[PDB]
Design a protein around this ligand. Sequence first.
Ligand SMILES: CCCCCCCCCCCCCCCCCC(=O)OC[C@H](COP(=O)(O)OCCN)OC(=O)CCCCCCCCCCCCCCCCC
Ligand SMILES: CCCCCCCCCCCCCCCCCC(=O)OC[C@H](COP(=O)(O)OCCN)OC(=O)CCCCCCCCCCCCCCCCC
Lengths: 98, 171, 51, 98, 48, 120, 83, 347, 106, 175
Amino acid sequence: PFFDVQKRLGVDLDRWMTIQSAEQPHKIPSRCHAFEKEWIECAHGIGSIRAEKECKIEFEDFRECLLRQKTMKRLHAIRRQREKLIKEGKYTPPPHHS
Amino acid sequence: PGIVELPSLEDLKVQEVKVSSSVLKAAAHHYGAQCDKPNKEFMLCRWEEKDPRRCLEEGKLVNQCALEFFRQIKRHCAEPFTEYWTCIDYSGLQLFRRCRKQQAQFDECVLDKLGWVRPDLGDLSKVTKVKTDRPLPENPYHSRARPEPNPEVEGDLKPARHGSRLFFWTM
Amino acid sequence: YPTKETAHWKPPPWNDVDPPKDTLVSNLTLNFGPQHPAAHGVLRLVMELSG
Amino acid sequence: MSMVYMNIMMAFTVSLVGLLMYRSHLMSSLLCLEGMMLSLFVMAALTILNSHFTLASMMPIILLVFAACEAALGLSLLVMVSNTYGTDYVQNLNLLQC
Amino acid sequence: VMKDVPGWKVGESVFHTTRWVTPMMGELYGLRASEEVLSATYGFIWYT
Amino acid sequence: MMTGRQGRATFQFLPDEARSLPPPKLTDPRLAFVGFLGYCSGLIDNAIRRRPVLLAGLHRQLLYITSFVFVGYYLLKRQDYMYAVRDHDMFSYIKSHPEDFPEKDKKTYGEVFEEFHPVR
Amino acid sequence: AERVAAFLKNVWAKEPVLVASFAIAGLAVILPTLSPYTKYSLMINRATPYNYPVPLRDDGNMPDVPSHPQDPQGPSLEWLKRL
Amino acid sequence: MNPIIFIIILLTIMLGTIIVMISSHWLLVWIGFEMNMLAIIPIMMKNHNPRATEASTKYFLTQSTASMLLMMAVIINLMFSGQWTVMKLFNPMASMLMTMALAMKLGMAPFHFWVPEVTQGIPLSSGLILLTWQKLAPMSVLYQIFPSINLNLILTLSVLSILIGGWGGLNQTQLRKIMAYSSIAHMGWMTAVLPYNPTMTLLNLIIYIIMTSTMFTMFMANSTTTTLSLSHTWNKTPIMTVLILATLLSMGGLPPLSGFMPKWMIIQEMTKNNSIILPTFMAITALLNLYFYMRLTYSTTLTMFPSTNNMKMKWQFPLMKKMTFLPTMVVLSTMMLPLTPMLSVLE
Amino acid sequence: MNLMLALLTNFTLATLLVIIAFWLPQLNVYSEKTSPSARLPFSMKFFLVAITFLLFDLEIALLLPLPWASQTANLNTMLTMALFLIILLAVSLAYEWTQKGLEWTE
Amino acid sequence: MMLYIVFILSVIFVMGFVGFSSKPSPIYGGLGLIVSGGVGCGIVLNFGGSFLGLMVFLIYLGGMMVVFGYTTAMATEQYPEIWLSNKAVLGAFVTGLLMEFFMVYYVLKDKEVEVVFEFNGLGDWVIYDTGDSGFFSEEAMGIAALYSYGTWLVIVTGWSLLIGVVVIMEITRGN
Ligand SMILES: CCCCCCCCCCCCCCCCCC(=O)OC[C@H](COP(=O)(O)OCCN)OC(=O)CCCCCCCCCCCCCCCCC
Ligand SMILES: CCCCCCCCCCCCCCCCCC(=O)OC[C@H](COP(=O)(O)OCCN)OC(=O)CCCCCCCCCCCCCCCCC
């Protein structure tokens, strides 16, 4: 905050909703709770200039959980390869998968 | 990145409890009292390990306890129990309060023939403590080592040397 | 710095008020008859309304 | 990103272009403004729902409430313009040129 | 399927961490019939 | 640059560590100038309201001087605190990173060669 | 007083709907702070188990934590059965 | 307006800005802008004429478009970081959108066209709020996200604002249009130094507000809104012409006046970062503003324009406008350069 | 699926009834007849009732979660904020009422 | 094809937007937005946002858009020009549907397109969560928390709505 009145007065006006790994009703966890926790703890206290370099592994995993860009790339490759072989009759789906 | 380790299909094989949800609902209160120990060990494992691959042995013991629990009912109390869960199954919401007469017949049977006492209101929601030999996981999140904090600034605060030192100002 | 593209420009009003000359016609005129002609039938009422 | 985001982001872009390219009716431009909010509401809801960010579930409601209140203010100004000139044409709002 | 794809490692993780990650719907039902996938994805939302 | 200081007690005009610094002297020339500005504001107040500039409302002129001097005193305390903190941070960093601030082995002019550029 | 009572008479004669509205709203704001059963609403909401009760690892010195659900230790719902 | 309602509306304008300034959550920042916009529209409409309605409509359209772009940036930031904390943004597209949204709210060039028109169309007191208090919230946001701002974008907006503000003011005879272009030009200085030292952004903002507040207050004291109506002041309140002269020279950045201080401190910070060309260009271009400030001083204080006969009737009555804080503001607007090191209180 | 089928069926039938309501009279082949923007002027009052409905309707959006909100452990906070919302809804009405925002006389 | 319900709805969502963004007569502009809103709610429902979806219908369609149409009738339009009977309106509409058609073509064929962001065309179902067996609606729990966690949000949101009533009465009085 520009003026950190919340910290001075010790009153929580809007921090409770800033991150998804904060306390939730009925302890419902967000899908990426573990990744966000690990990134936040890695980067805590060291400042953003250092964090952009020293917590890159945590942030990359957190970003993968959020948007699943690399998971979808790997699924698309398998599906693309699979339909190629089914066209050429060099592969047959098993009984399950059908 | 590494190769995700997965158990073999044979390692995952167990005798399942192939009964319907109305059967499970009808037996749930006695099942919760009788099979508490293996169930609570399994749940302690799942929350501590945070990995289903690390609790497969405890998960199998959950099935075996359940199967032995239902074999006891099939052995001494099948007819009262069958009547009870057939009433539960009729309701779209599987309501307990519609079948108190058949519940009483089943509860009376298991108390006489097995000694089972139905847990009271609130009992099954207690937090309990479980004995276990599985050691407490050390790094369940597989966290890397944390970055080192910046050196602390310490010492006594002294006035600035020759003041602000802004251009020509002497203070 | 006057130019050909600002020749038509004029200083604004001294008190910032432009006259209201555009559209102000709020009085409806209604030729009013009875909803059902069973009883009155032959009443024509030229009414001027304001809301 | 997932495929749905492409279309929701297109909808925001379309309504933004519609907002910045006026015709005559001031009303037609306010609708584009409300269209922008609708696409924001949908994109926010999809992100929050899919991630199971529980406490953020209330955010789309606050967005809708504040944007509707701002739309009421916009409609009130349009009515005052229509009272002055008898139409909501934006070409009559050129007094301040000088 | 990926036997002859060059450079492919079978079962490789996309995360740096070796921690268990809950799979998403595509990872579980990625290679299956549309009926089962449809039931798993929208069955609850579409039930009355 | 100093927004995230490790020992920044946030949103505090004068944190407690500032009490270790000597206070501004009530005869500080900067405080005297602040009082003078207050006196000028009092004269301007008379002028714009067409009262006799020097004599009118001496009570009002006094409150102009007092309020400027009063606010000026605390602003100087913070000013001196912020420069003390800047120096404290600078010297701590230099100590923590001696490899970045080496003492130079510095020669006499008898040894260093400087080119001569005649002015003719 | 009696000025106050006269004023309440004039509104009860002219604006009975508003008198009823302010009376009902006033009870809504006052009675909860005075009711003795308000405390039970909080207790009942906390006795409803939405989540699984994760067991604790028994270090060996938690006397007040039951080992089995039917053991005497732990919070009771006896007050709720009677209420 | 009912005076109590006018007070509540002003307090809500302030509350919206305060919410932006204390919020750690992007949604609360957005709410603060929404609350602020809602409360300021009535004060623009309060004199009920077609020009005030046009200005209110133009302002509403500009601010609402900006606020939708701000929300778009926040949501994109959520998608790529999963959090709402007011801090550096985690996506370059979100950064560009928020920077443009805040530039639109500030009236920076080339998003500037609304500032001259909206200021001209509203009363002087409303223009004072628009050109001073309304800058606080967008600046407070820029102050917190600057590490993620594209350097070329923010410097481009700054250069254009200084150029457009300087050139736009040259062709003006209306006081409210002059102050609008002066505001645009001064905006470019604040953002130009932001990447290097945000503290000097705050210094320039504070001094700009004080000088602008002084100018509007003196224009309100005599109910002057044009150059020629201001040229009568010498024959009514001579002291006001001297005060106007000092403030205009200060706004021109002339030593030894207060307005030189922000220009002086910004040049220093940019040169420490090996930015020589840009501060030199900015300093030279600022001479445009000095020119149309000096033109005002010529018609107000340094010469005597023709008066009217009916001005004699005004001699018999006193100034009864409040002119709140004017003696203090005019002194701070001119005589603060010797206290320049006090800028460290902003650190 | 069922809800989509129901909505499709309901609006499909409504559509068929509408078109046959428009075509069936053409069986008669009735004779040809050969014999027949801007303000309205709109009253400000009718605009202000619509706007008031909207602002009141937005406050109702905030009150809809009340049945779920009562399940919380922090009942004192929940009850305080619930009554706060309804009271501000009443204060909006009181302000409208006492400035003659609810009148129909010109 | 039912497994791409979300994508199909989002295509209709964009088409409705191109509807009112080409800005035909305000009467038909409101119709495009109403259809887009209804489709928008449909997309939110299929992500598990039942309460959020119904809010769109109740508040956005049954509230805000009713007032827009009300105001359009009184202050703007009384009869409309035929939709797509104007050069710019039709050209804008054609342009929008061509851009939408090509985005849809490449995303389906290459299973991926790239404009500012990278988009994947496998199907929106692939990102869904595979673990659900709680005895409540998470969305409802989050919204209900407004009154426990969100005290500050309620105050400022409540204040803004009250000020909205005051401001609009000020604006429309005319003196
Ligand atoms: C007890 C009552 C309650 C109020 C008490 C408050 C008093 C303090 C407030 C400030 C007032 C200072 C005293 C002002 C005296 C004015 C007297 C006056 O007006 O008479 C005029 C006098 C003689 O002039 P005359 O000969 O009659 O005519 C000449 C024609 N040209 O001309 C003069 O001789 C006037 C001389 C100039 C006035 C003195 C200048 C003071 C400068 C103050 C500097 C401030 C520095 C602050 C630093 C503080 C730091 C700690
Ligand atoms: C402290 C370090 C920093 C130093 C920076 C410089 C500080 C000075 C700036 C202070 C702020 C400006 C206020 C200065 C006070 C001005 C006082 C004054 O000029 O007298 C006003 C005079 C009175 O006119 P009247 O109403 O008829 O009263 C007759 C009196 N018996 O009115 C008139 O008679 C009209 C005069 C005709 C116009 C003359 C124009 C030239 C004015 C020269 C003074 C302006 C100085 C400002 C520029 C800075 C100079 C360095």
